[PDB]
Design a protein around this motif. Sequence first.
Motif, PDB file in Angstrom:
ATOM      1  N   UNK A 185     -13.176  -1.920  12.717  1.00  0.00           N
ATOM      2  CA  UNK A 185     -11.844  -1.403  12.402  1.00  0.00           C
ATOM      3  C   UNK A 185     -11.783  -0.144  11.522  1.00  0.00           C
TER       4      UNK A 185
ATOM      5  N   UNK B 160     -10.372   0.865   8.660  1.00  0.00           N
ATOM      6  CA  UNK B 160      -9.018   1.175   8.290  1.00  0.00           C
ATOM      7  C   UNK B 160      -8.873   2.322   7.290  1.00  0.00           C
TER       8      UNK B 160
ATOM      9  N   UNK C 132      -8.121   6.100   8.517  1.00  0.00           N
ATOM     10  CA  UNK C 132      -7.009   6.187   9.432  1.00  0.00           C
ATOM     11  C   UNK C 132      -5.715   6.173   8.648  1.00  0.00           C
TER      12      UNK C 132
ATOM     13  N   UNK D   2      -2.846   6.293   9.752  1.00  0.00           N
ATOM     14  CA  UNK D   2      -1.792   5.555  10.425  1.00  0.00           C
ATOM     15  C   UNK D   2      -1.803   4.140   9.850  1.00  0.00           C
ATOM     16  N   UNK D   3      -2.879   3.780   9.138  1.00  0.00           N
ATOM     17  CA  UNK D   3      -2.970   2.438   8.538  1.00  0.00           C
ATOM     18  C   UNK D   3      -3.138   2.540   7.036  1.00  0.00           C
TER      19      UNK D   3
ATOM     20  N   UNK E 295      -1.955   0.003   5.049  1.00  0.00           N
ATOM     21  CA  UNK E 295      -1.938  -1.334   4.511  1.00  0.00           C
ATOM     22  C   UNK E 295      -1.790  -2.310   5.661  1.00  0.00           C
ATOM     23  N   UNK E 296      -2.016  -3.614   5.416  1.00  0.00           N
ATOM     24  CA  UNK E 296      -1.878  -4.656   6.416  1.00  0.00           C
ATOM     25  C   UNK E 296      -1.471  -5.883   5.681  1.00  0.00           C
TER      26      UNK E 296
ATOM     27  N   UNK F 295       0.843  -6.258   3.730  1.00  0.00           N
ATOM     28  CA  UNK F 295       1.310  -6.044   2.364  1.00  0.00           C
ATOM     29  C   UNK F 295       2.807  -6.369   2.288  1.00  0.00           C
ATOM     30  N   UNK F 296       3.284  -7.012   1.240  1.00  0.00           N
ATOM     31  CA  UNK F 296       4.699  -7.338   1.135  1.00  0.00           C
ATOM     32  C   UNK F 296       5.495  -6.084   0.783  1.00  0.00           C
TER      33      UNK F 296
ATOM     34  N   UNK G 192      -9.828  -4.332   0.840  1.00  0.00           N
ATOM     35  CA  UNK G 192      -9.631  -5.498   1.716  1.00  0.00           C
ATOM     36  C   UNK G 192      -9.597  -6.712   0.779  1.00  0.00           C
TER      37      UNK G 192
ATOM     38  N   UNK H 186      -9.527 -13.680   5.471  1.00  0.00           N
ATOM     39  CA  UNK H 186      -9.011 -12.349   5.266  1.00  0.00           C
ATOM     40  C   UNK H 186      -7.500 -12.381   5.158  1.00  0.00           C
TER      41      UNK H 186
ATOM     42  N   UNK I  87       2.963  16.140  10.821  1.00  0.00           N
ATOM     43  CA  UNK I  87       3.728  14.877  11.030  1.00  0.00           C
ATOM     44  C   UNK I  87       2.884  13.631  11.110  1.00  0.00           C
ATOM     45  N   UNK I  88       1.625  13.824  11.414  1.00  0.00           N
ATOM     46  CA  UNK I  88       0.781  12.626  11.457  1.00  0.00           C
ATOM     47  C   UNK I  88       0.488  12.084  10.068  1.00  0.00           C
TER      48      UNK I  88
ATOM     49  N   UNK J 251       2.942  12.243   7.879  1.00  0.00           N
ATOM     50  CA  UNK J 251       4.241  11.902   7.322  1.00  0.00           C
ATOM     51  C   UNK J 251       4.397  10.438   6.820  1.00  0.00           C
ATOM     52  N   UNK J 252       3.905   9.477   7.595  1.00  0.00           N
ATOM     53  CA  UNK J 252       4.004   8.063   7.236  1.00  0.00           C
ATOM     54  C   UNK J 252       3.322   7.715   5.940  1.00  0.00           C
TER      55      UNK J 252
END
Lengths: 1011, 1011
Positions: free
Chosen positions: A1, A3, A6, A8-9, A11-12, A14-15, A139, A146, A418-419, A421-422
Motif C-alpha cells: 500500500x 500510503x 500518496x 490522495x491518502x 489518513x484512514x 480517522x474520526x 499506522x 490494524x 489541484x492534486x 488540494x485535498x
Amino acid sequence: RRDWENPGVTQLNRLAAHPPFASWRNSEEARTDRPSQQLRSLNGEWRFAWFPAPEAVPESWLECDLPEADTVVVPSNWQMHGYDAPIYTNVTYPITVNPPFVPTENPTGCYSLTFNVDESWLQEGQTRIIFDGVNSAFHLWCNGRWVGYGQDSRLPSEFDLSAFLRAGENRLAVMVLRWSDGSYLEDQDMWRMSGIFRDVSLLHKPTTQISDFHVATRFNDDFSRAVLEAEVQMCGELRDYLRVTVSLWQGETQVASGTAPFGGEIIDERGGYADRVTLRLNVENPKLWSAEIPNLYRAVVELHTADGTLIEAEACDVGFREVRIENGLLLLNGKPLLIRGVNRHEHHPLHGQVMDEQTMVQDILLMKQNNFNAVRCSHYPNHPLWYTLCDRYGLYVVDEANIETEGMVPMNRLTDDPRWLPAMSERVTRMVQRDRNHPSVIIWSLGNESGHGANHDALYRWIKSVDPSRPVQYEGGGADTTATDIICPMYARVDEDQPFPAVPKWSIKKWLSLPGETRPLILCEYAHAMGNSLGGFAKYWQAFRQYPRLQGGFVWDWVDQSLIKYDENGNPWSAYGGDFGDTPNDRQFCMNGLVFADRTPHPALTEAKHQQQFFQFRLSGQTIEVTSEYLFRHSDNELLHWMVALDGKPLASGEVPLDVAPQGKQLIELPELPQPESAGQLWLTVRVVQPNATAWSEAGHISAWQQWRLAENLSVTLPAASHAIPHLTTSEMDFCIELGNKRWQFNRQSGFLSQMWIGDKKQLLTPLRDQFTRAPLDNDIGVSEATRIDPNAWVERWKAAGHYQAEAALLQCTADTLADAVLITTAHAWQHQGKTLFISRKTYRIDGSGQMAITVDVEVASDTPHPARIGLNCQLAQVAERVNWLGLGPQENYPDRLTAACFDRWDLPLSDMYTPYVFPSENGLRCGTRELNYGPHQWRGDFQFNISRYSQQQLMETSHRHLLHAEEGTWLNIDGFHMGIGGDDSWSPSVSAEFQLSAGRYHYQLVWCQK
Amino acid sequence: RRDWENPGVTQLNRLAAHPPFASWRNSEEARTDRPSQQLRSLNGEWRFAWFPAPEAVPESWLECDLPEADTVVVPSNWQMHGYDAPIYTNVTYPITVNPPFVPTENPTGCYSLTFNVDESWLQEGQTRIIFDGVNSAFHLWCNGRWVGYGQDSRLPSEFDLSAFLRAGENRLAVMVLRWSDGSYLEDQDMWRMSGIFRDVSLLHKPTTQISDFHVATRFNDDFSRAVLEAEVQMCGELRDYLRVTVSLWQGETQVASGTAPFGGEIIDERGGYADRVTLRLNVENPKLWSAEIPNLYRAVVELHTADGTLIEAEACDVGFREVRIENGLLLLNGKPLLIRGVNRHEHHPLHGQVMDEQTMVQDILLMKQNNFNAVRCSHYPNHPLWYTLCDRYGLYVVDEANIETEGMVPMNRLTDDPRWLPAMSERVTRMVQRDRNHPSVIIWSLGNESGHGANHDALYRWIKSVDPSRPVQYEGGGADTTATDIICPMYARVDEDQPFPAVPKWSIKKWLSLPGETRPLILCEYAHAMGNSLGGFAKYWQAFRQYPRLQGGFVWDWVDQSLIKYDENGNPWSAYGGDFGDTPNDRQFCMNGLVFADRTPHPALTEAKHQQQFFQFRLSGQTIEVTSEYLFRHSDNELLHWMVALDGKPLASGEVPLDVAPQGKQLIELPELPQPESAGQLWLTVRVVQPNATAWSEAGHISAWQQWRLAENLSVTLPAASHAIPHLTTSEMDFCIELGNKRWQFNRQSGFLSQMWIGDKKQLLTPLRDQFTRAPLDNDIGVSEATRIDPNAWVERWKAAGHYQAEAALLQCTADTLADAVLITTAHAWQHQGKTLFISRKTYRIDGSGQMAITVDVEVASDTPHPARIGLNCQLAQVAERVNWLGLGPQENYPDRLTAACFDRWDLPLSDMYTPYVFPSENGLRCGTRELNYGPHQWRGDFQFNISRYSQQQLMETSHRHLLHAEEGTWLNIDGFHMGIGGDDSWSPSVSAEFQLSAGRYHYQLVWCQK
Ligand SMILES: [Mg+2]
Ligand SMILES: [Mg+2]
Ligand SMILES: [Mg+2]
Ligand SMILES: [Mg+2]
Ligand code: NA
Ligand code: NA
Ligand code: NA
Ligand code: NA
Ligand code: NA
Ligand code: NA
Ligand code: NA
Ligand code: NA
C-alpha cells in the motif's frame, strides 16, 4: 500500500476533527474545567524501537514487544533520545525533492504500549484514542489488529478503538514514519525531528453524544448587548426526549441559559439538520475580551434527556469580542489594533518539539512583561493548551495551517496543483474545526512560504465562508494576493523598497498606498533577531504609530532554536545546524530569537519592550504629557515615578498616580526644580510602575520609561596650577614620559603607545592601536559562506577591501615639550595592496595632572566600504571585578539599537559586559559614554565601548561561545564611532544609511587618567 | 481495502487530467485533426461476467478468462445486456442512505480484453490506458498485476501501463462496481446503470512530452485585435535544445506561429517553471466564434528540438470569443446573449447511456433546426466528442461537474462537509482541466441539486482563480447564493412567486430587482416538457425579450429517457420507471423531453421553435418590419415569403430578400392587395426561408414565421331559402326529425341526440353528450399517486369534486315547430352527491337546408374546481382516412400552447391527429377551428376539437401507449372551451389563471351538417 507516498491518502479510519472535548458526566466539573474521568492520558513510559525503514519492521512486533526495544518517555522526539540525528535545514528539503515519493531509507520509530482498560469503558459508549501530534505519519494497530493511518504532524488524529479493545490488558502498536508525502507540506525553517511528540490519550464518549459545537458572539453598535449563538451537533440515535441546554457563566454567576430539542431550521428544499440545534442567548453589557483585559465567560453545553438526566457535557471559555476589517483597519471591539507581536515556534532546548505547560506559561509571562500583545503560531497549529493560555492570560493569536513548501521550485509548485488540494485542505479545515471556539484566535493563516496557488484561493474562500468572524491572511506570492485580507509581508523595510521581480517587498509606508490598495498592513515577520540584531527596530514603531493602516507586526522570532549538547566532561553547550552531523544544514540560522533557548533574554528584548510601550510621553516645561495607547483599559494599576539627576547624581524625584483613560492624555506638572550647583547635564527619567501584581507580573513591574535632557551647565572652570611638570625622555627608539609614579612609553617606529606603568606595574598587554573592524555579526555575515561567498555581505566587502588585513604605516611621530605638558604627535596610514584605506592623525598631551589627552582625527577613503568602527583598542594587563560608567545602559546597546537604554551611572560585574551570543561576535558595546572606570583607570570623552576577556580576533575566529576562553587581561575597545548592527533581515545588508560610517573624516577625543 | 466505501480514496495511481491528447508524430495530421497512429481504440468485443458482489469474483479471473464469461460489446451499460435491471429513481437514492457505505450486494461486472501491443510502443515512451467513462468505480489489473483504481463515472481515468505490458498479446481485467461512495455524488434524475459505457483507448506518448496546454484568447476594445496565449507544460527530460512551436491556422492558411525554449517567467521567490512556456501570438482582425457563426482556427502545438526534429504534436480547435458579465449582463464578444437553451442528458433508447457520433449529430441538428443556440450538460461532463461538435456546429455550452446529491437530508449534507471537499474537488477540477480549451464552453457549473455548502464556495473560487475566462454558475441553495455569478433558478415562474422557505422561487421578473441584486438571470431549468406540456412557453419568451437581465434559459429537457422493451412477439415498446421490475421508482418522470427517445419530435418542439425565432416582425399597413435578433451575422441566407389567403383560399404571395444587419430592422412594403371575391377573414403569413443549405440545415429550411389577420368582410348574405321543411315525429320515447335522406333521433329519456342517419347508415355509435373532463395530462396529475394522493393536483380536485363521475339529470326536453325548422330544447344538470356541478342548456335547430345548428349555454358552480373543458363528444360510426379543417395547425395545439400554430386549411391522415405520448392522455387538440371535415360530416363554428380512435376513458385508463387499442368508429371531442395544459413544472398546478375555465357561464355554437 505505501500510503505515505500518496497525497490522495492523508489518513484512514480517522474520526472527524472537533473542538476540545472531555466528555464530563457532571456539569459543574465541565463548568469549572476540572479533570474528567472520561479523559485519560496515556503519556509516560512506552516501548520504542528504531528501524531504518518500515520494511525492516518484524511482523512479530504487532503481536508482542520486541525484546530489544527500550523504555522511553512519550511524548518525545526520537532524535532527542539519540536514536537518530535531528536536522537543521531552513529552505532546502531534507529529502530529495521528488514528490510524492520519499527515501527508501526512512527512519521508522516503533512505539508500543501495554495498558489496561476498564470494562465499564467497553461495556457501553465509545472509546477513542487521540494522538495530539505524530511526526510525520503513522499506522496504528490495536491488539495486533490494524486500526488506521494519519498525516499532518500538527493536528490530532483520533480513531475509535471500541471494537478493538478488551477488558484488561491491551497492547497498542504505533509505526511512525519520519518521511511521508506530508513532509512536502512541512518545510518549516526548524529542526527536522520525528515521533509521538505531543499527548496521547483516551476519551470515553457516550453513544449518543455531542459531536461538534460552535460558539459565536455578535454585537450591537456599541457593544452594549450581545447574542451568544451556539450551534450543537450530535451523533447517536435521535429521540424526541433528547435535549440540549447551553448555559453561560460569569464566574459563579449564571448569566443565561436556553434549552431545546434537536432539529434545526429549514436549510433547503430537503429540509434542515435533524441532528443539530442552535441556542441563542442574550447578554446585556457583556464584559468584553481583549488582550488588555481578558474577560472570559464559561459556556457549558449539556446533552440530556427531557426528564433532566445528563448524558454528557462539553464546554469552553468564551471571550465576547468582534474582529473586523473596516475602512482599511483591523478593529477589535470597534477599535483599531496595534499588534505588538512575535512569531513563536514550539521549541525546548532539551525536549526538542515537545511542549509543556511550564514552558508555555514562562513564554507568555515573558511576552507580556515585555509588552507583547500577540503571537503568531509559526507555522502550524500549536499544542492545544497554548490557546487556552492565550485565552486566559490574554494574547491575540494568528492560528496557521501546517502548510509550508518553500523548498519547491517555483514556490507554488504544489499549492497551485489541484492534486494537492485535498491534502492541503485537510490542513486548513481540521485547524478551523478544532480551534474556532478560541477567542484568543483572531486571524486565520493559510500557512507559510508556499507561493500563491489556486489551492490557497479555494481555502481562503472556504474559511471566509465557514467563519466570517475572523479575517484570513497569507503572505505567499507577494504578501498582497487575493488570498489575503491583510497585507502581511515578511521583512519589508520601513522606507526602503526592495523591488524583487514578481514579489517585490515595497517600503511598508509606500505599500499601503499603491494604486487601488486599501487593506491594513501587519508584517507577518519583521526585525530578524539573529545574534546581535534588532538594529532599527524603532524605525518600525515610529511608522506604526504614525500611519493608521500600519498596524504592527510579528517579530522573527521568540526563542533561539538551539539544542543542548554535552562535551566530554558532560558539560552542556548550545548546538546549532550541523552540530549533530546533520548535512546539508543551515548552521546558526535556527537562532533568531529575542530570548536564548533557556528563556534568558537577549539584550534586544529590552529594546522591544521599550518600543512597544503602551504609554507615550511628551515634555514641555515642567509638564509631562502621558498618553495611553490602551484601547480598553484605564491606567488603574499604574503610577508614574520621576527622577532628576545631574550626571548620574540624583537631585530630586517623586511619584504621581496615573489616571489615564484608553487613548486619553494626563498632564503632570513637575515641581519647581531647584537649580543645581555643579556643571553637568540634568536628566529627567520617568517610569511607569504597576504597584500591584497581576496574573502575569509582580508588584513593582516597570512597564514603560522615557528620558529627556534638561538644563545643561557647561564647565567653564579652569582647572588648576598643576603641582608638577611631566618629563620627556627621548631615545632612538622611544619617547618616554615620566610624572610621579607614572610612566608612558611611545615607540618611535610603530608610533603607538606601547606601555604604561603605575609604580613598576605595566598596564598594557598590547599597545593602544586604532581599530577599524569588528568580529562580524550575523547581520554582517548574512548568507556568505567560505565555500560560497556572498560578495554583497558587509563582511565580504570589508575582507576584500583588506580591512581585516590592513597594516599600519607610520607617517610621523614627534614629541614636544610644552610649558606644562608633553605633546606627542603621530600619523599612520593603513593600506592594503597599495591603497590607502585610512589615515589616523593623533595627539597625546600629558600634563602635570597626569591626565593623558588623546585627540584622534581620521580620514577614510571614499571608495572603500564604510568601516565597522572607528576607535582604538588595547589589552589591559589588569583584570578587575567591576565596570562602572556614566553613559547609556545598563545593557548592551548600539547606534541603531539604543532607544531603550538610559543615560545614568551604571556599575556591573565585568561578565555582564559580555553578551554570550551562541555564535560569537562583536558584542557588549554601550554607547553615549562620557565616563568609563575599570581598575585604577579612567577614560573620559564621548564614546562607545566594550570590555571583556575576549579579543575581537578570538570572537571572529570562534563559532560557538562554548569554545571561547578568557584571554590574559581585559580587551578594551573604545570607539569614537561605531556602525549600526541592522537586522531588517539577516541575509542582506540591512544597516540603514544614517548608521553607516560614511562621513569620510572623523574626529574624537578622550582623556585617559588614573582613578 | 474497500476503496469503494471511502470518499477519502477516489483513485489510485491515476494520471493527471488534461485536454484531449493524440500524440501525433506528424504535424500536418495534427493540423487537420486526422487520426493518430499513437491513439488507438480498444473499443469492440470484450469478455464480460457479472457478479452480485466483489467478494464473489474468483482470483482465477485475474490470470485467465472465465469460461462462463460471455463476449460483449464495449462500451455498453451491462443493464442494457440484460444482466441486471436498470433503475429509474428520481431524487431518492437507489441505495440506503448511509454514506459512505454501500450495500453488500453490489453488482460487479468483470470485464476483460486480450489485445496486442507492438514493441515499438514499448521500446520507447509511455503507454497509458484511458477509460472515458466507467460507472461507478473500478479496479484495474494488467497481465494479472494490479494497476490502480478510479471513481467519477463521467470523466476519463488514465493509467500508465508502460511497466505492465509486453510486446504481443496482453490481458486487462476490470472489475467494475455498480455502487460506491462516488454514487453519493451521482444522484441525477435518470436511469441508474453501470459498466464501461464510454470509449477505452490506448495512447502512446514520448517520454519527453507535452503534459498539458491551455489556450486563451484576449481582445482589444472592439475585438479587431486579439492575442492568442498558449501555456505549455512538459514532462520528461528538460534539455536546452527543446523548443515549443505554437502555430495558428485558419483553414489552410497559417495565421501566425511562434517558438521558444522552455522556461517560464519568474513566479516567486523560488523562480519560475522551468518546465513550462507561454507563447503569445497576435491576431489581427480575427474571425470571431459564436453559435451564429462558429468560425474556428486550429492551434497546433509542437514539442521538438532546435535542430528541427519533431518529438510530438498536440492541437485543438480555437474559437476567438470573450465571455464576460458586465453591468448585469452576460456578454459574448461584447453583445448581450439571449440563451435559447435546452438541458440534455446522454440517453439512447437502445444503448442506454452509451453515446455515439450519429446520435450526437442528430441531436445537434435538430436543436439548431429548432432555434436552440445553447445546451446545458445536465448534470455531468459529457462524452468528449460532444464538445468538439458544439465547437464546430456552433452551440453555447454549460459544462457541469458530476455532483448531484439531492437525496440527502438536508440537501447540503455532504456539500457542507469538509470531509467531502476532496471528492467534490476532483469532480470540478478534473472537468476544467479536461474541457477548458473548448470555445463552445462559455460557463462552468458546480453541479446540480446538492444544496449550498462551503465546499461549493471553495470550488467556486478555485475555478474563478484558475480560469477567469468564463462565469461560474450553480443553482443549489436558492439559485442566487454566493457560489454563482448568474441567478439560475429552476422552474421559477414569470409573474408568480413561489415563496418556499429558505429557497423561494421568485417570479423571475421580480427576482432581478430584489434589493441589492444586480446579476443576470438565466434559468438552469424551465418549461418542464413532460408529456403534453409547454403551456405558457410564450410567457417566458415575452419576458426574456423585454427585460435585458432576463437572458433566457435551458428548457427541461431534450429527449424522453424511455427505454425500449420487447413484447412476447418481439415487438418493441417504450418503457419507463418500474418497467424493469425496478422499485422503488419514479414511473414516467424519466420522460420530459421535446423529442421522443428516438428523436421524433413531440409537438411542443415547434412551439419552442417559434418562440425562439431570431427575427421579430411587426405590421403596419402594408408594411412589415423585420427586426433581427442576431447579434453577429447579417441575414445572408434568408429571404422572406409572404402569403395572403382568404379563409385558407390563397389570394397572393411573393418573396422579398432579407437584408438585415444584426439587431437591425428592414421595412418591406407589400404590394397593392387586390380586393377579395367574397366574405371572410384575410390572413397574412410570412416565413423566413434559407435558400441555401448549411452545415445544419437543408436548402429551403424555414426558420421563422408569423401571421396577422388582415381585412375581414363579414357575411351579410342571406342564404337561399330551403326548397324544403323538416318533419318532426313525436313518440313517447323520442322526437324524430326527417329531412330527405337524413334523420335525427333525440332520446326523450336522456335528453340527447342518440342517433343519426344518412340514407340507411346510422351515424353514431354513442350519443352526443356534453363533456367537462379530459384524460388527465402529466401536469394535471403531477406527483399524485393511488397510494399517495396529492390533493392539490388538478386531477385530484376534479375526482374529489365528482367531475369524472357526474351523472346528467334531465331537466328539460321539448320539441317545437317553426316555419322552416324544428327546434329541440334540452337542459341537464350534472351532479355529484347532491351537488349541482354544471348545468347545460341547449337548442338544436334543424332546418330545410339540412343543417343542424346547436346552441349551448353552460353554467359552472362558482365553488367547483374549474373544469378541464366544456364541450361535447360522441363516437362516430365512421372511420375515415383524412381530417380536414380550417383552424389552427397543423400540429396539436392547446390554449396556452398555440402560438406556433397557424390558421389555414389543414388536411392530415386521421392518424396524425393522435399524439403518441408514451404515457397516454388527452392529446391531439387543435384550437381556433372554424370548420372541420370528416367522412360525410362537416361542423362549423368556433371551437377546439380532437379526433381519434381512442376514447377519453380509455386514454385515462391506460399507462403505456403500446397498450392502447383502436376503438370502433371515431371519437369526436368538440369543445367550446378547454383548459390550458400548463407546464411551468410538472409537480404543482401550473395553469395560469387566464387559462382556467372560471367564467361561471359559457356559451358556444356549432352547426353540424353534411359535407
Ligand atoms: Mg499519504
Ligand atoms: Mg521557510
Ligand atoms: Mg472511494
Ligand atoms: Mg435531481
Ligand atoms: Na498604525
Ligand atoms: Na531561521
Ligand atoms: Na493609576
Ligand atoms: Na564568531
Ligand atoms: Na433579455
Ligand atoms: Na425527470
Ligand atoms: Na438575405
Ligand atoms: Na393515462
